[PDB]
Design a protein around this ligand. Structure first.
Ligand SMILES: [Ca+2]
Ligand SMILES: [Ca+2]
Ligand SMILES: [Ca+2]
Ligand SMILES: [Ca+2]
Ligand SMILES: [Ca+2]
Ligand SMILES: [Ca+2]
Ligand SMILES: [Ca+2]
Lengths: 198, 188
């Protein structure tokens, strides 16, 4: 409490998160500590949290969300990564969110969401829960629809500019390639129970 | 006149135009009219020439959605209300409209066959369409009855955006919209 208030003062000061108050940071620190199994928040713990708290169930996208959280790529979510991540994930502006979803969707980190990446991401839900018949021609149709709507220069990939321009025009395209933000009900429940909002 | 525009702005359910814009739409309608009323043939030519729709099935369904009283003419009020949704519609307005277009028999469920015929006409081969239909049901059919109820469809909004772009071809593309608003309403 003294422990956590002083930690919260320091993290509120140092963290780049833009949306929690210092008291909310303290609640987030306590929550993190209460969720820890071992000393560090690893992939498997973070996966469980996404599944249980945010109803995400699909392996590829959960891994991509983890990687976006894990800013320094050490395969652990630090306290400051937990706050900063959740700040965007729960409260981000469109701008923040578009940068986040682009990062999720750019599977190899080369700066472009490629046709191939689109196909992998769109197919991954049907790998998990298959239709009776192979769905690949229909996925390819969706990929072409995406490219038609979003690829300005017809090079079969979306630059950051391609994606953000299109999402600003149609914000429903924010998560075009899969669910990587919490639905409104999940978000509300976590805010209410963990942060006391509403 | 102006009086029609005063009356229509007061009376109409359209949500997105100003009274001056309404007046512009009334003048537009009258500038385009060929006889006394806008019938299906004229309405189809407008969809074809100004909004880049090419297929008979699609154009018939858009007509029927604009023709709310099913009298086979597009009244001034229908033209304005339909264009309000069509050019500036909210998500809810657009989903309602797209559901209307796709639910061919008007029973309140999009069936597999309705979805296949309408995706096919919207996206003008069949292998991808047949897949799309199975994908949509797998993703959106909550109660597993092989049909999309209106709730099935509307709950799917924030969950399935690219699938909703497929269905959204009954609305005009951004390019066609912009050009019409620019010419007729004086917008960017
Ligand atoms: Ca880390
Ligand atoms: Ca990439
Ligand atoms: Ca197939
Ligand atoms: Ca491009
Ligand atoms: Ca009528
Ligand atoms: Ca039906
Ligand atoms: Ca159903």
């Amino acid at each position: 409490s003294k422990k956590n208030q002083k930690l919260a003062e320091e993290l509120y000061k140092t963290s780049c998160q833009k949306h929690f108050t210092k008291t909310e940071v303290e609640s987030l620190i306590i929550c993190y500590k209460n969720l820890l199994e071992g000393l560090k928040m690893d992939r498997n713990l973070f996966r469980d949290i996404l599944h249980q708290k945010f109803n995400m169930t699909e392996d590829l996208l959960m891994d991509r969300v983890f990687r976006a959280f894990d800013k320094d790529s050490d395969s652990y979510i630090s306290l400051t990564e937990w706050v900063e991540g959740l700040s965007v994930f729960l409260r981000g502006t469109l701008d923040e969110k578009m940068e986040y979803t682009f990062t999720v969707f750019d599977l190899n980190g080369d700066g472009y969401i490629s046709r191939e990446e689109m196909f992998q991401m769109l197919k991954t839900c049907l790998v998990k829960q298959p239709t009776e018949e192979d769905p690949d021609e229909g996925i390819k149709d969706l990929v072409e629809i995406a490219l038609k709507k979003m690829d300005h220069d017809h090079d079969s990939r979306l630059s950051k500019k391609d994606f953000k321009d299109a999402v600003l025009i149609e914000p429903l395209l924010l998560e075009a390639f899969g669910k990587c933000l919490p639905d409104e009900k999940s978000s509300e429940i976590f805010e209410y129970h963990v942060l006391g909002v509403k």
